[PDB]
Design a protein around this ligand. Structure first.
Ligand SMILES: CCCCCCCCCCCCCCCCCC(=O)OCC(COC(=O)CCCCCCCCCCCCCCCCC)OC(=O)CCCCCCCCCCCCCCCCC
Ligand SMILES: CCCCCCCCCCCCCCCCCC(=O)OCC(COC(=O)CCCCCCCCCCCCCCCCC)OC(=O)CCCCCCCCCCCCCCCCC
Ligand code: HEA
Ligand code: HEA
Ligand SMILES: CCCCC/C=C\C/C=C\C/C=C\C/C=C\CCCC(=O)O[C@H](COC(=O)CCCCCCCCCCCCCCCCC)COP(=O)(O)OCCN
Ligand SMILES: CCCCC/C=C\C/C=C\C/C=C\C/C=C\CCCC(=O)O[C@H](COC(=O)CCCCCCCCCCCCCCCCC)COP(=O)(O)OCCN
Ligand SMILES: CCCCCC/C=C\CCCCCCCCCC(=O)O[C@H](COC(=O)CCCCCCCCCCCCCCC)COP(=O)(O)OC[C@@H](O)CO
Ligand SMILES: CCCCCC/C=C\CCCCCCCCCC(=O)O[C@H](COC(=O)CCCCCCCCCCCCCCC)COP(=O)(O)OC[C@@H](O)CO
Ligand SMILES: CCCCCC/C=C\CCCCCCCCCC(=O)O[C@H](COC(=O)CCCCCCCCCCCCCCC)COP(=O)(O)OC[C@@H](O)CO
Ligand SMILES: CCCCCCCCCCO[C@@H]1OC(CO)[C@@H](O[C@H]2O[C@@H](CO)[C@@H](O)[C@H](O)[C@@H]2O)[C@H](O)[C@H]1O
Ligand SMILES: C[C@H](CCC(=O)O)[C@H]1CC[C@@H]2[C@H]3[C@H](O)C[C@@H]4C[C@@H](O)CC[C@]4(C)[C@@H]3C[C@@H](O)[C@@]21C
Ligand SMILES: C[C@H](CCC(=O)O)[C@H]1CC[C@H]2[C@@H]3[C@H](O)C[C@@H]4C[C@H](O)CC[C@]4(C)[C@H]3C[C@H](O)[C@]12C
Ligand SMILES: C[C@H](CCC(=O)O)[C@H]1CC[C@H]2[C@@H]3[C@H](O)C[C@@H]4C[C@H](O)CC[C@]4(C)[C@H]3C[C@H](O)[C@]12C
Ligand code: CUA
Ligand SMILES: [Cu+2]
Ligand SMILES: [Mg+2]
Ligand code: NA
Ligand SMILES: [Zn+2]
Lengths: 43, 46, 84, 58, 98, 259, 79, 227, 514
């Protein structure tokens, strides 16, 4: 498949930001719940 | 009638890659987080 | 089978109307005669609290939770027996 | 009765750009709004009910 | 025993249903209900492909019973050949609706 | 302009209101069964009736009034209805499987026999036989109605169709009375369970089928059908025959062999 | 007499994994025999085999429930 | 029981379990052979610059890849079915023991002669004696005589459970209102473990089975003493 | 305009898009649930609580992955997008009913989430067997909300099946016979036929569970003369066809992907592929009791189900060898989609083979309800179905969006997922052979090593899922518009450009009858 160059190029810095934000969106909420597991188990 | 072409045949906007990142983060993040919060809900009832 | 009649030279509206009034409705009239003859309320059987009948694992979502949907006092006993 | 299908065909083929579910007239609009209001309202109510049933009333 | 009172398609069919019905009566197929019969497909006797625009997708079943259909856009102008078997097709544009 | 014969349907709100009505009915049943309230259920049944009314009204508008039902569109609707009926047959098959499973190997709790100890089955030669003649008769009258329509006979089409509907209603009334008179209930073990759930779903289909026929009766009164294009009536008739065949299986299996 | 029983032997009438009817049949048989003997003026010792078999096969709670029901008059089996 | 880092089946305690081990070795060889053959062929197809993209004829090579697998299936089915029928063979037991599944423990009944019955619960982890296995020990074991054909009848008094003892090749579902039969025969004395094998609620993971196989003489004294 | 387009749609592409979005979201939920499962089993002891909360998680994981992720993506997503394009049809036969099939899913999903919110959830296993699922052992609304969720998903799929079958039979060009349609179209029709016949039986069965729970019927209650085993028969009569429903569209996409990246104009042995899918579809209805080998059935019945089950290996084998034969002599393009397809071929074969081990009722006595079964089905589902979905997604993403993905990132995503799934499931074979039961929140100490390694592998898979989200974002963020696509002469779905216009085939294709 051939394609044209990116209309709005995503630089390495921009990709690090998107990857970091993506990983954090998954890891933070679950991490919070898992961390407070004991506080939940008996309360 | 409707808009056609790349980035126009979808229910979400891709005009701004950062606003898009926020949307995708909420979309996929809410899905992944739901089970953890339901588990938390079940633990905090009894 | 082939029934005991005949036509078949061309089954059309006239033939099906012939069958409706000459066979179908008369059959319904006969069964209606037979039924509204052999009816008559049969003497309800003695009540025996069998454990496989009058099941109640959860109360019904209507009335007092103990009566079936189309409960007939005359013929349907409650788990404790016929009603007053 | 008399055959009035042609009258109905004229009404529904009238080039007014209306989608078929609203092309009959003002009543279609009313019926639609009633339907959608009961649907959306009833859904909000079901969400409320779920919120209620989600918690123990000891 | 008998009588009337039920409309016929001739009296009551409308819209596209009526168009297909009347076209079929004149032996025409404006709504592509039938499969076109192939010509010899040579340079001199190409398959004539009707179209209401200046290009139409052609699907060529090269040999009878082939499971693979060869697809390509046929453009207005000089006849084009199937990429697989070489049979000729030529677009014959417009009209349908008078 | 399109140059094919298929129907591109106008964007519609009915699929959404239909889906939401399903949520309201199931949520409603749950509320009723566990939180003693029928409010949600009432709303669900209402929006569901509204959705069906408008959706099918639009199908009539699209066909009878706008002419979108070309032969190709009609052919698709034929396959659709046949497929729908097949899925209904399989649904009933599950209930017949349950019936035969229980009745062919009666467990000790029933007395190890069928019908179970304490169960006094209805006489299949009484109302159940009458019900059988009623549905079979309606199968003949609906065939008369079909032929009358094809032959362009308005009066006799209406007459035959009216007779078919009256018979469906008669069956429904007879069944309702049989339910009330039955000495056994849905709570009387697996006998009452299989009996009422199977005949109950069948009765529901009879009501649906009768309603479909009534729709046809009124569409006919309004001259919607031509002697050659009347799929709504054909579908109603196929569905009606299905309802008839399911009954014959219920009669032979549950009322007769299972007594 | 003719006994010296270890456990219920293979019964060709119930050769499969589901043994529910084997237990049930022998329970019925014992109580039918016991009723015949106690009735016509005879001895229940002839009913012994059935008693041993059903006792060996039947879950205690089943026998217990069936006994309670025969007493209550709600036993669905024919005896 | 299973030991740390175990790869295959627990060692066979009964002749039937030995039979299954050999049948599994037989089948696993076929599984290894076919899966590696497929992996190999994938790599073969992907490792050449030579090409042939024109139409390839199929009605010739399809015979091979229809007949071969058919033959292989038969080579698996034969010993499979032989073992299946062997497990169904009439054997005539010397003893009949019943086990009832319950929401979270098993009860046993030895009612051939005396009316002996008891409950069997998992030993809580906090109460395990040194050297005892977590989640596997029970207060009252199922003492049974070794080298003897025993008939086990399985049922349940509430939800479904499943009575299993891997080392003996046993697993019989415990269904309320049903009496399932299986036969047990240990070639050796010892302790043999199993666990409830049908989801039954809150403590499904904690209602183990422990069989204690001893000589007939000890089984009899134990029976008397357990009255 | 937004509401008219996205809530009132009658367009097959837009509806397919809604399905892909729904399925992607469901996949996130299903992944989270699978992590909760593996976190609980990651080390000896109890993490969350007892088997109830644990099994509510296991049950939901299964329902979500099957009904909300796999089916919606494969059938509703790829099916709606590709089927009309592949036969040159202007849309589906019933474009409005098609929209209801979609809109029934969110409500269905809401009922599933509701069931886990109220009471103590439904910790029954996705099979929902009574008496555990009955009103005594699972009192309260949970199980009833689960049944209703299944009802809605069932109606959605049944109407979807009617739509697909009608569209495929009735809307092809007049000259195109059924033996001239692409293999993906064939896979979808066969899948639709299985859905049409199997779901009504499940509906019958769960309705009987609902009445036993609420109307005092006793279909499955011995006290009223019922039988718990009857439920199992009705469920599995649907259940086995269901697993073939989950893999068939996958087989279809694999045929297209392998053919495409082998630089071939057609798959090897087309008629043999059609024959194989139809045989598989047929055989899939007469083998259900292999899910009941320990319930106490007659030996002859067990001998039959063992034999009938094995036969499926023959037609499935013809497909595997035909895919390899399609690769043969090809100008191989090592694209990310081809990698997913190659992994599919091998891993599905492994899972299929362990299924043949399980077909033997003798051996199944010892393997049933153990992790050997879990290993088998995750190889065919988490590696088979999922790899076909990933392959199809990367392959067709440019068609659906008009943008290209970054191939290097997509190859990285495949590598991570490959290691993750194999580390997660391979050790489960050992746990199964050695006796670890299914649906356990904790296990005897001897099982610690393999459970530890398996849970670590599940975290590797989580990393791949997060990366996937980023990859999709990068594609939409960079906006590299597609220009040219090769092999359009044998891949009609690409002939109208990327993305194709809202309305395609307004003027149908021209195909001579000759
Ligand atoms: C649940 C939704 C999350 C909310 C987040 C949205 C916030 C809106 C702010 C609002 C701010 C205004 C901004 C407006 C424009 C852009 C945002 C958008 O329009 O807003 C909404 C749009 C767009 O969606 C988004 O917003 C971003 C999605 C980005 C997706 C990228 C997907 C990449 C994968 C490729 C897919 C195929 C495309 C490729 C091919 C290209 C297509 C041809 O959606 C839809 O209108 C339809 C989707 C319906 C259903 C999908 C799954 C839902 C399941 C729910 C069941 C719950 C049960 C209970 C569950 C209850 C929880 C406990
Ligand atoms: C991560 C797990 C770590 C486990 C380490 C094992 C420790 C050994 C102690 C070393 C200690 C040695 C002493 C132990 C002997 C006891 C033998 C026995 O009685 O117990 C018998 C058991 C034990 O199994 C064995 O007799 C060992 C076989 C090991 C095969 C390993 C393949 C590893 C591939 C690498 C990544 C996995 C994913 C690949 C996918 C393969 C799919 C199965 O048999 C089984 O049922 C397990 C396997 C079941 C099903 C898989 C069938 C398909 C295999 C496909 C092969 C592809 C090869 C291509 C090459 C693969 C290229 C990808
Ligand atoms: C995508 C889903 C999927 C698919 C396609 C399959 C396919 C198969 N399954 Fe599996 N299965 C499941 C999903 C799937 N399964 C699930 C979810 C369960 C558990 C349900 C639960 O309890 O929750 C399960 C359970 C399960 C059991 C029950 C085990 C138990 O509970 O004790 C059995 C029993 O026989 C089985 C068998 C098979 C077989 C023989 C195939 C066959 O179709 C495989 C055929 C393929 C091959 C054999 C490989 C390719 C062939 C060759 C390379 C040719 C040469 C081969 C030979 C000569 C052998 N499966
Ligand atoms: C399609 C079905 C499916 C899938 C994919 C999976 C995936 C996974 N499952 Fe599975 N699982 C089941 C179906 C599935 N499972 C079923 C049926 C059961 C039995 C339930 C019962 O016993 O009742 C079960 C049971 C089960 C158990 C046994 C529980 C027990 O017995 O106690 C375990 C244990 O490890 C487990 C783990 C996992 C893990 C770690 C994954 C991981 O591999 C998951 C990794 C993430 C993905 C592969 C999802 C990616 C896909 C998307 C996110 C879509 C992306 C979007 C687009 C491309 C548009 N599962
Ligand atoms: C008159 C003949 C026509 C039959 C139907 C007419 C009226 C009843 C209302 C709805 C029936 C629709 C379907 C059948 C569902 C359950 C069986 C009902 C059959 C019936 O009507 O059975 C009655 C029981 O009523 C009961 O519980 C009824 C209680 C009503 C509760 C309805 C509960 C609905 C459960 C719905 C689940 C629907 C799932 C459908 C899934 C479809 C596929 C997804 C019998 O009465 P009884 O007093 O026990 O015995 C008579 C003694 N004199
Ligand atoms: C509690 C029950 C309620 C449920 C009832 C269910 C359905 C019934 C509802 C309505 C049915 C009755 C009439 C319908 C309405 C209008 C009919 C008028 C048409 C008419 O009079 O038709 C005539 C037929 O006779 C006719 O009706 C005759 C019709 C009557 C037939 C049945 C009577 C039976 C008589 C006894 C015979 C039994 C002997 C058995 C013989 C063996 C059978 C093989 C023929 O005439 P024409 O000159 O060719 O036609 C000119 C155009 N109209
Ligand atoms: C028709 C196809 C070709 C025929 C080949 C065989 C395949 C199906 C056969 C269908 C009819 C079989 C009926 C014969 C009855 C004999 C078996 C019997 O007697 O089985 C009974 C139940 O059968 C039952 O409901 C049986 C009820 C149905 C179960 C079979 C499932 C198929 C049904 C769906 C098919 C869809 C087709 C659509 C129809 C229009 C009871 O259970 P047992 O196990 O006996 O328990 C006895 C124990 O106490 C001791 O062990
Ligand atoms: C008090 C009772 C309430 C109970 C709830 C259900 C209530 C009623 C269900 C009855 C359904 C009535 C259906 C009305 C359909 C009218 C639209 C119609 O019939 O539309 C026709 C097309 O068929 C079409 O789509 C055919 C459409 C097929 C619909 C049939 C489906 C039945 C629905 C069953 C739903 C429940 C399932 C069972 C539960 C377990 C229009 O084409 P023609 O007739 O050729 O006209 C054109 C000519 O005029 C040209 O000259
Ligand atoms: C309470 C417990 C669970 C409750 C679940 C309730 C779920 C949904 C309830 C609300 C749905 C009702 C709304 C009416 C649906 C009518 C669909 C219909 O009639 O669809 C038709 C197609 O199906 C055809 O014909 C033939 C097929 C007709 C199907 C009729 C739809 C009935 C829905 C219920 C089906 C149940 C499944 C049965 C198996 C057990 C028409 O297709 P369209 O795309 O519209 O138009 C195409 C145009 O060319 C027509 O001019
Ligand atoms: C299976 C899916 C999950 C995979 C594992 C998740 C990967 C780790 C994600 C990190 O997330 C967090 O980490 C914390 C600690 O590192 C928390 O802080 C917490 O802990 C603290 C530091 O000890 C405090 O500063 C705050 O009060 C606090 O809530 C926290 O809330 C949570 O967001
Ligand atoms: C009015 C109409 C004649 C045709 C027309 O509309 O012009 C007549 C002809 C046949 C119909 C009738 C049929 O004879 C069948 C029915 C018989 C009657 O006992 C009651 C009304 C009955 C339900 C019908 C009412 C009547 O008004 C109809 C509808
Ligand atoms: C006859 C039919 C279609 C041929 C065609 O019209 O092109 C072909 C397609 C697939 C063929 C089958 C498959 O190739 C699988 C089998 C292969 C063996 O070589 C013979 C029987 C076998 C079962 C084949 C019989 C027959 O030749 C089939 C069924
Ligand atoms: C499993 C099902 C019964 C389900 C139920 O108990 O409700 C029964 C009904 C009929 C049985 C089949 C028929 O009796 C015919 C066959 C008889 C053979 O002895 C075994 C296979 C055989 C093909 C049977 C397999 C299985 O036991 C079937 C399919
Ligand atoms: Cu008892 Cu699991
Ligand atoms: Cu299966
Ligand atoms: Mg099990
Ligand atoms: Na744990
Ligand atoms: Zn050609």
């Amino acid at each position: 498949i051939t394609a044209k160059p990116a209309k709005t190029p995503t630089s390495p810095k921009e990709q690090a930001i998107g990857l970091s934000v993506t990983f954090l969106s998954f890891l933070l909420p679950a991490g919070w719940v898992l961390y407070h597991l004991d506080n939940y188990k008996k309360s | 009638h409707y808009e056609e072409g790349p980035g126009k045949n979808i229910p979400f906007s891709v005009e701004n890659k950062w606003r898009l990142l926020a949307m995708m983060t909420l979309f996929f993040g809410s899905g992944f987080a739901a089970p953890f919060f339901i588990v938390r809900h079940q633990l905090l009832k009894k | 089978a082939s029934a005991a009649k005949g036509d078949h030279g061309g089954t059309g509206a006239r033939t099906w109307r012939f069958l409706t009034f000459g066979l179908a409705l008369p059959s319904v009239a006969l069964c209606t005669l037979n039924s509204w003859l052999h009816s008559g309320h049969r003497e309800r059987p003695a009540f025996i609290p069998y454990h496989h009948l009058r099941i109640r694992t959860k109360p019904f979502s209507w009335g007092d939770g103990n009566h079936t949907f189309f409960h007939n006092p005359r013929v349907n006993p409650l788990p404790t027996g016929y009603e007053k | 009765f008399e055959n009035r299908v042609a009258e109905k065909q004229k009404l529904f083929q009238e080039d007014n750009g209306l989608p078929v579910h609203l092309k009959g007239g003002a009543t279609d609009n009313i019926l639609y709004r009633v339907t959608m209001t009961l649907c959306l309202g009833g859904t909000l109510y079901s969400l409320y009910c779920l919120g209620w049933a989600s918690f123990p009333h000891k | 025993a008998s009588g009337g009172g039920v409309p016929t398609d001739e009296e009551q069919a409308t819209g596209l249903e009526r168009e297909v019905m009347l076209a079929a009566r004149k032996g025409q197929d404006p709504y592509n209900i039938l499969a076109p019969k192939a010509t010899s497909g040579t340079k001199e006797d190409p398959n004539l492909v009707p179209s209401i625009t200046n290009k139409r997708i052609v699907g060529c079943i090269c040999e009878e019973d082939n499971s693979t259909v060869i697809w390509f856009w046929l453009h207005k102008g000089e006849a084009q050949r199937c990429p697989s078997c070489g049979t000729h097709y030529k677009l014959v544009p417009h009209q349908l609706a008078h | 302009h399109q140059t094919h014969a298929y129907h591109m349907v106008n964007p519609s709100p009915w699929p959404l209101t239909g889906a939401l009505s399903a949520l309201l009915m199931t949520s409603g049943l749950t509320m009723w069964f566990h939180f003693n309230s029928m409010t949600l259920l009432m709303i669900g049944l209402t929006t569901n009736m509204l959705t069906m009314y408008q959706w099918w009204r639009d199908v009539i508008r699209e066909s009878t009034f706008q002419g979108h039902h070309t032969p190709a569109v009609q052919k698709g609707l034929r396959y659709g209805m046949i497929l729908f009926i097949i899925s209904e047959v399989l649904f009933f098959t599950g209930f017949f499987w349950a019936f035969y499973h229980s009745s062919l190997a009666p467990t000790p709790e029933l007395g190890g026999c069928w019908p179970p100890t304490g169960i006094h089955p209805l006489n299949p030669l009484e109302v159940p036989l009458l019900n059988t003649s009623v549905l079979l008769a309606s199968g003949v009258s609906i065939t008369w109605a079909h032929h009358s329509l094809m032959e362009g006979d308005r009066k006799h089409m209406l007459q035959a169709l009216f007779i078919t509907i009256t018979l469906g209603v008669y069956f429904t009334l007879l069944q309702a009375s049989e339910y009330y008179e039955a000495p056994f209930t849905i709570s009387d073990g697996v006998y009452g369970s299989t009996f009422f759930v199977a005949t109950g779903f069948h009765g529901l289909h009879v009501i649906i089928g009768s309603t479909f026929l009534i729709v046809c009766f009124f569409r006919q009164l309004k001259f919607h059908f031509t002697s050659n294009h009347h799929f709504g009536f054909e579908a109603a008739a196929w569905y009606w025959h299905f309802v008839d065949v399911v009954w014959l299986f219920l009669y032979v299996s549950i009322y007769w062999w299972g007594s | 007499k003719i006994k010296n029983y270890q456990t219920a032997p293979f019964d060709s009438r119930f050769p499969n994994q589901n043994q529910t009817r084997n237990c049930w049949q022998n329970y019925l048989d014992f109580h039918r025999c016991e009723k015949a003997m106690t009735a016509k003026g005879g001895d229940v010792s002839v009913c012994e085999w059935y008693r041993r078999v059903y006792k060996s096969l039947c879950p205690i709670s089943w026998v217990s429930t069936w006994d309670d029901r025969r007493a209550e008059g709600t036993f669905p089996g024919k005896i | 029981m299973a030991y740390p880092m175990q790869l295959g089946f627990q060692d066979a305690t009964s002749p039937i379990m030995e039979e299954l081990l050999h049948f599994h070795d037989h089948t696993l060889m076929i599984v290894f052979l076919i899966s590696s053959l497929v992996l190999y062929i994938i790599s073969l197809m992907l490792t050449t610059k030579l090409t042939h993209t024109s139409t390839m004829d199929a009605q010739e090579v399809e015979t091979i890849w229809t007949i071969l697998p058919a033959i292989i299936l038969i080579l698996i089915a034969l010993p499979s079915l032989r073992i299946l029928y062997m497990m169904d063979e009439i054997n005539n037991p010397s003893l009949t023991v019943k086990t009832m599944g319950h929401q979270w423990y098993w009860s046993y009944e030895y009612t051939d002669y005396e009316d002996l019955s008891f409950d069997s619960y998992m030993i809580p982890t906090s109460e395990l004696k040194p050297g005892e296995l977590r989640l596997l020990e029970v207060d009252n074991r199922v003492v049974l005589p070794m080298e003897m054909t025993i008939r086990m009848l399985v049922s349940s008094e509430d939800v479904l459970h499943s009575w299993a003892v891997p080392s003996l090749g046993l697993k019989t579902d415990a269904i309320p209102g049903r009496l399932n039969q299986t036969t047990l025969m240990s070639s050796r004395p010892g302790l043999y473990y199993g666990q409830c094998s049908e989801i039954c609620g809150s403590n499904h993971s904690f209602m183990p089975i422990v069989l204690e196989l001893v000589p007939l003489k000890y089984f009899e004294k134990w029976s008397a003493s357990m009255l | 305009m937004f509401i008219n387009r996205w809530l009132f749609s009658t367009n097959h592409k837009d509806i397919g898009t809604l399905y892909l979005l729904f399925g992607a979201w469901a996949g996130m939920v299903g992944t989270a649930l699978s992590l909760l499962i593996r976190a609980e089993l990651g080390q000896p002891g109890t993490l969350l609580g007892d088997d109830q909360i644990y099994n509510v998680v296991v049950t939901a994981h299964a329902f979500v992955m099957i009904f909300f992720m796999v089916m919606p993506i494969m059938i509703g997503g790829f099916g709606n997008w590709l089927v009309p394009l592949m036969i040159g049809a202007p849309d589906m036969a019933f474009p409005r009913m098609n929209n209801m099939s979609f809109w029934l899913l969110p409500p269905s999903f809401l009922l599933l989430l509701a069931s886990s919110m109220v009471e103590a959830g439904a910790g029954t296993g996705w099979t929902v067997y009574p008496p555990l699922a009955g009103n005594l052992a699972h009192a309260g609304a949970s199980v009833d909300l689960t049944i209703f969720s299944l009802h809605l998903a069932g109606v959605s799929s049944i109407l979807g099946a009617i739509n697909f079958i009608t569209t495929i039979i009735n809307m092809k060009p007049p000259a195109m016979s059924q033996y001239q349609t692409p293999l993906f179209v064939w896979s979808v029709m066969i899948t639709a036929v299985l859905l049409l016949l199997s779901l009504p039986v499940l509906a019958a069965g769960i309705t009987m569970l609902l009445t036993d729970r609420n109307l005092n019927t006793t279909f499955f209650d011995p006290a009223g003369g019922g039988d718990p085993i009857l439920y199992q028969h009705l469920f599995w009569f649907f259940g086995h066809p269901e697993v073939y429903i989950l893999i068939l569209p996958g087989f279809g996409m694999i045929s297209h992907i392998v053919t495409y990246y082998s630089g071939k104009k057609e798959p090897f042995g087309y008629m043999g592929m059609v024959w194989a899918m139809m045989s598989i579809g047929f055989l899939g209805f007469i083998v259900w009791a292999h899910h009941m080998f320990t319930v106490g059935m007659d030996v002859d019945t067990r001998a039959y189900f063992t034999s009938a089950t094995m036969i499926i290996a023959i037609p499935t084998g013809v497909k595997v060898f035909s895919w390899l034969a399609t690769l043969h002599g090809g100008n191989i393009k090592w694209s990310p989609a081809m990698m997913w397809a190659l992994g599919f071929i091998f891993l599905f074969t492994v899972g299929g083979l362990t299924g043949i081990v399980l077909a033997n009722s003798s051996l199944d006595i010892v393997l049933h309800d153990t992790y050997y079964v879990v290993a088998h089905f995750h190889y065919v589902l988490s590696m088979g179905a999922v790899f076909a979905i990933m392959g199809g997604f990367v392959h067709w993403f440019p068609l659906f969006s008009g943008y290209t993905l970054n191939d290097t990132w997509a190859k990285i995503h495949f590598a991570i997922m490959f290691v993750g799934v194999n580390m997660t499931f391979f050790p489960q074979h050992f746990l199964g052979l050695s006796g670890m039961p299914r649906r356990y929140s904790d296990y005897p100490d001897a099982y610690t090593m393999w459970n530890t390694i398996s849970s670590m592998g599940s975290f590797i898979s989580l990393t791949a899922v997060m990366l996937m989200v980023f990859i999709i974002w990068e594609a939409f963020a960079s906006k590299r518009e597609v220009l040219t696509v090769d092999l359009t002469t044998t891949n009609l779905e690409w002939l109208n450009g990327c993305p194709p216009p809202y309305h395609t085939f307004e003027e149908p294709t021209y195909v001579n009858l000759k």
